[PDB]
Amino acid sequence: SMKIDVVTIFPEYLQPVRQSLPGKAIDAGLVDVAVHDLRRWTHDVHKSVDDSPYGGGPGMVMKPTVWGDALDEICTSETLLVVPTPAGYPFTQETAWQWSTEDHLVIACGRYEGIDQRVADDAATRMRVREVSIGDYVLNGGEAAALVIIEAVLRLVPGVSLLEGPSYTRPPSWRGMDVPPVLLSGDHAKIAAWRAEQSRQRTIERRPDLL
Amino acid sequence: SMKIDVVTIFPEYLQPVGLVDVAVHDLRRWTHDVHKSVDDSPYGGGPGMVMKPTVWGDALDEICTSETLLVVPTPAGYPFTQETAWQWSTEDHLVIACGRYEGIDQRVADDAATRMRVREVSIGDYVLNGGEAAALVIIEAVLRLVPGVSLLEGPSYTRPPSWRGMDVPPVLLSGDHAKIAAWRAEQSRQRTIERRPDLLGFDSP
Numbered sequence: 001s002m003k004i005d006v007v008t009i010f011p012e013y014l015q016p017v018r019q020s021l022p023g024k025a026i027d028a029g030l031v032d033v034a035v036h037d038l039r040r041w042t043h044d045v046h047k048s049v050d051d052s053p054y055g056g057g058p059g060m061v062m063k064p065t066v067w068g069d070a071l072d073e074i075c076t077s078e079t080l081l082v083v084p085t086p087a088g089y090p091f092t093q094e095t096a097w098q099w100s101t102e103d104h105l106v107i108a109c110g111r112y113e114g115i116d117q118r119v120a121d122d123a124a125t126r127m128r129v130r131e132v133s134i135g136d137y138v139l140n141g142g143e144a145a146a147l148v149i150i151e152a153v154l155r156l157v158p159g160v161s162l163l164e165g166p167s168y169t170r171p172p173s174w175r176g177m178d179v180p181p182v183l184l185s186g187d188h189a190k191i192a193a194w195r196a197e198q199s200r201q202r203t204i205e206r207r208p209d210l211l
Numbered sequence: 212s213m214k215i216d217v218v219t220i221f222p223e224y225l226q227p228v229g230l231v232d233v234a235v236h237d238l239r240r241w242t243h244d245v246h247k248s249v250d251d252s253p254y255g256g257g258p259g260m261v262m263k264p265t266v267w268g269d270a271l272d273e274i275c276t277s278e279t280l281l282v283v284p285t286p287a288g289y290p291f292t293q294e295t296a297w298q299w300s301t302e303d304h305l306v307i308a309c310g311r312y313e314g315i316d317q318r319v320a321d322d323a324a325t326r327m328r329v330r331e332v333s334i335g336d337y338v339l340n341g342g343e344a345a346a347l348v349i350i351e352a353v354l355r356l357v358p359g360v361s362l363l364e365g366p367s368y369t370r371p372p373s374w375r376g377m378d379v380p381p382v383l384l385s386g387d388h389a390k391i392a393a394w395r396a397e398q399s400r401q402r403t404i405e406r407r408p409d410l411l412g413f414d415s416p
């Protein structure tokens with residue numbers, strides 16, 4: 001059973017996740033994903049979520065007073081607070097496996113230049129906090145990263161190396177290209193060895209970093 | 212200016228998407244029979260189903276041209292990075308083919324590559340149920356680089372200068388750009404070493 005809370009200034013962006021949830025998983029109480037508009041915790045009539053950076057520079061920084069109030073209300077001592085950021089530790093399949101057993105994830109979606117660092121540092125004095133990157137590219141905000149994280153974790157919750165090689169299905173011949181005959185051979189030891197070699201060759205060509 | 216076509220059996224997942232136009236297409240629109248079957252069991256055995264080449268071939272025939280960059284997200288792909296985003300930001304036409312089940316028949320990409328440029332790419336070393344979330348990541352990373360639209364970044368701070376008894380580092384309040392530039396450098400180097408030693412050419416933990 002897992003609760004996921006997402007905090008964002010674009011709550012509609014998280015409409016897809018709540019759709020893709022099977023009804024049976026929700027009714028068996030195995031999962032609950034809730035999305036919260038950050039501006040609910042703003043203090044001023046202009047609903048400000050950001051301000052200029054100390055020390056100057058580009059972009060605005062999200063306000064600690066607003067985030068602090070939000071996390072105070074949503075988090076508990078048992079919460080795993082997830083903060084997507086290009087500056088984070090790498091989020092990998094290992095990470096997804098580990099988090100799939102958590103009772104409560106809270107994902108803080110940041111925008112612009114980032115979130116005042118005191119938010120995470122304060123939170124870390126009473127809960128577990130993980131700043132993570134889903135990849136070495138830059139996005140405008142953490143919302144797309146939240147979708148990726150939610151999907152990678154929840155598909156490892158029951159009910160909710162080398163690269164893989166090519167897959168084939170019917171028909172045996174299509175636009176002049178035949179399925180590799182070994183796959184139709186009924187020699188399953190040989191098929192396994194062909195697939196292993198396919199995997200080795202693909203990994204050398206595409207991901208030599210994994211060797 | 213850029214056109215992006217996304218092809219998927221779950222088009223409503225792409226809802227959270229005039230310098231660019233983005234169109235989303237239901238792959239089932241190119242099936243011929245009632246059940247609208249898009250997948251079948253893998254030749255050679257294995258787990259899960261494989262998307263059939265026939266449906267994909269018909270969809271891509273209509274949607275792509277020889278100028279098209281066909282993008283296929285897959286955990287088995289070349290890495291999609293910021294360099295990739297820069298490269299694709301000047302393309303006229305991206306088509307993103309979103310797979311489901313355990314994958315797409317390899318002949319779809321192989322056939323496409325006889326007519327156009329094809330890129331199988333991974334957005335990271337984790338596994339998703341389908342390419343749709345990866346498509347959203349790729350679209351965001353690329354569109355923000357479209358004309359008219361290393362080391363890890365260190366910590367950022369804004370007002371107030373003291374919050375819950377936690378002070379903004381004093382150098383950031385000093386107005387000394389040289390001391391500030393140097394402090395930020397030491398922060399970034401320190402963060403990179405700790406979190407991403409691979410970026411500086413060191414062994415991963």
Ligand SMILES: COc1cc(COC(=O)c2cn[nH]c2)cc(-c2cccnc2)c1
Nearest residue numbers: 085086110114133134135138139141142
């Ligand atoms: C909370 O701090 C953030 C968060 C994000 C969104 O996450 C990603 O882009 C990401 C997550 N894994 N890989 C990339 C982006 C920025 C940002 C944007 C532009 C310039 N500088 C910083 C800052």
Ligand SMILES: COc1cc(COC(=O)c2cn[nH]c2)cc(-c2cccnc2)c1
Nearest residue numbers: 285286310314333334335338339341342
């Ligand atoms: C077209 O072939 C695919 C595509 C995808 C979706 O993309 C990603 O998950 C992804 C993209 N970058 N990093 C990860 C997933 C699978 C798949 C799923 C489960 C088991 N095995 C394979 C296959």
